Amino acid sequence: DYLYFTTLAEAQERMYDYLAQRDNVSAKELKNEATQKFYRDLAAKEIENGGYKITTTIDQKIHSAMQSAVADYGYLLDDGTGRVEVGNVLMDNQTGAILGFVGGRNYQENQNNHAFDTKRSPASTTKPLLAYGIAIDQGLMGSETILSNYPTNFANGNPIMYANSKGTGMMTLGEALNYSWNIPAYWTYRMLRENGVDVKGYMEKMGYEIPEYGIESLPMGGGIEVTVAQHTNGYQTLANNGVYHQKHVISKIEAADGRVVYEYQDKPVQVYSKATATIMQGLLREVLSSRVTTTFKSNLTSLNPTLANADWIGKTGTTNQDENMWLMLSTPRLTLGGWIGHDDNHSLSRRAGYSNNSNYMAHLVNAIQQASPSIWGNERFALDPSVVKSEVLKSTGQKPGKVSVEGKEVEVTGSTVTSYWANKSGAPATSYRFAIGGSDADYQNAWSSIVGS
């Protein structure tokens, strides 16, 4: 199966690294294609002959339970468009250890590994990581910050669409994420660009390879393609209070004569502040609980109510032509990534992610739990004490204050709310451009509504 080859390839990747140090301390010659093959062949020959013990991270009961789950419940993914393919990776949030995965529907009839090898746009699941998480991490927004969802166009003059909608008006970050509106995301990444935020640095620190960052639809998955295993690692990062642990299936390689030629060490990396990550956790909780973009929490409740009450957070994604659906799920302890789609890129049905993948993955979650009862955990996500609380106007997402609205000072007041920030001073006082994004025409409309106090 996938298991043998996934496991063997990373083990022989580790041997490669080991040897290029042992059998040579090799130069920048390591960028030579002939040295690359040579050490690959040597790494392969090493494992075949050296009588090595290769300890993987794979939990036997859980992985086997996952293989049974796709065998028994994979059919729930099929919607008339074919035998819908699938990839899932289950990851320990505190270590980056991969405990089990689904490579696809049936190895014998399709050998493509959809957990580890196949690469596809993360679509809207890019958003928490590339746009909102970074903007929060930079003190550029908090939990109740307002963004524009007013009609706007890409630089090439085509409208930013969401299904058949050209947009609406102002909305909170919560609303923007629960619905996965696109315009707010566009404006957020555009602000990071304009302010010279090293988004590349953040993404690369989590192991993401993206060839061109100068792309407007980047936060929506444009110009990105990723493996499920890698994309799961990004969500692990948010789940584990902002601390990245590199994904892996090999924990140790011992030679026949006892010695350790490779062993996992924990190298945590604080990619987002704990304030940021914890604030995002609370946003992603409501993404699932709101049920706007996924029936997951309902599906799971009907199967296992007690497990439905574990503290589930996550995000959905769907590519433009419904060719890819994603659902990423975390409890404090584990993250489970899910992708469905077709190898030839045919469109899925419009409810394929909303319903089918959601229902399928609720079944997968339950199978995992029957295989290892305590494993999802009863821990809850919680705000880090480093989080700054600002009482802000609901209408502006900023503190109450005076503003000039076409001449005339307005004392802006109304119903307030506690907004959570990841900077030092929290929310600013309200200014005329209170939201992320918006044209002068948008703001005339928005302030008119507000001024109807």
């Binding site: 298991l3 496991t7 083990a11 494992i47 013990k53 290769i54 939990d59 036997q60 924990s251």
Partner: peptide, 15 residues
Amino acid sequence: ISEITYSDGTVIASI
């Protein structure tokens, strides 16, 4: 013989 094991030492495959 080289062995690949689950986390609990149970052999997945011999090479």
